[PDB]
Design a protein around this ligand. Sequence first.
Ligand code: HEM
Ligand SMILES: N[C@@H](Cc1c[nH]c2ccccc12)C(=O)O
Length: 376
Amino acid sequence: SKEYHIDEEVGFALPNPQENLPDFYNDWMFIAKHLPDLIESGQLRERVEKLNMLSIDHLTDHKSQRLARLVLGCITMAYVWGKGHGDVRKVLPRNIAVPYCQLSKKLELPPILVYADCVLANWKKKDPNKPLTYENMDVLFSFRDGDCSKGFFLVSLLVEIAAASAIKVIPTVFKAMQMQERDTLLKALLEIASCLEKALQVFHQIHDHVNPKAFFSVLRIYLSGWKGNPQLSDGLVYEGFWEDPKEFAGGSAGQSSVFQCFDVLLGIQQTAGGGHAAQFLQDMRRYMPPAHRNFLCSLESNPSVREFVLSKGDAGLREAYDACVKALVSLRSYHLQIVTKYILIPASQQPTGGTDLMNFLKTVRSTTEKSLLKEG
Ligand code: HEM
Ligand SMILES: N[C@@H](Cc1c[nH]c2ccccc12)C(=O)O
């Protein structure tokens, strides 16, 4: 899946991202590099305001334009939120806004830090000989110290990598169906299930490397966007680029292609019925890179694995299919427990919004659970 920007090892994640830019953009790198202490001192907003209006013409390859998006994205957040106490900026300087809006228009990603920036491009191997594990990995950027950004951004990425083991099997599934190869398909569906079962254990690591109170109070506010945010009721104005303010949602893991990829594969019609859940998951594809957005297209336009499996009156083929759907439920069911610990409880500790966040996630899980065949 080379044309779709899918890697065999790390899937949707950027295979090995650049850690620095061409020297013409040293102004940018310095602010991004030293955010944690630039925020504490009132410098940051000054250091952004007095800055050159650099052009994006000296960004040659993809990995250059992505690190640019990450750097600009990370800075744009810290500017708008500051120390993160309700001290906000309602306007972005044209010195940083224009290059970010042009570079964003270029990659077809919106002008705001997305999952593709702060998880998929925001990582490196410490020792390139030892494998991909929290031990031997570090993010390129943070917001503060003790924001637990390393934990969230890397455990997210490690789940993207766990999913890669299943995502690379997908072409075997479609080959097998067309070539009426039952035995090949059963293994490939059992293989996908097995890899999604592994991805669940990877999810447990979040308890080890992320602190609820720190996460909820610190990192969550920088990852916060400006769609339906009363802090910025009419969104944010990108000075000189857009006439009037624009609204764009924050950098959630809900911009991940992993879960949406296997919903489409298994014929789980999430983005049908025209509910809030369906409308949310459809909107999040705007915040995915255009290559991945096209990949979920290809999956949709292929013949249904679901309606194929049901035809054959084959118990083995149904069980293998179910195993993939159960694996996907288990992941969503566990993710609800995570949100309970990391959103709901924290939000009740500090002096019905969280009630229908849980309804959104439970809707999406229930839609998945309804696709189970149960040998019928
Ligand atoms: C402390 C950890 C986490 C918290 C607090 C958290 C919180 C949330 C919340 C509140 C949502 C609802 C959508 C939104 O508000 O934008 C969401 C959605 C989502 N999260 Fe997470 N999340 C966490 C970890 C993860 C991880 C590690 C993954 C791995 C891929 C993940 C994948 C998703 C996906 C795919 C959605 C979209 C809805 C769905 O398809 O079920 N989350 N998350
Ligand atoms: N997408 C949210 C931000 C958000 C909600 N829940 C999250 C969990 C993790 C990270 C970010 C978030 C916004 O509009 O601003």
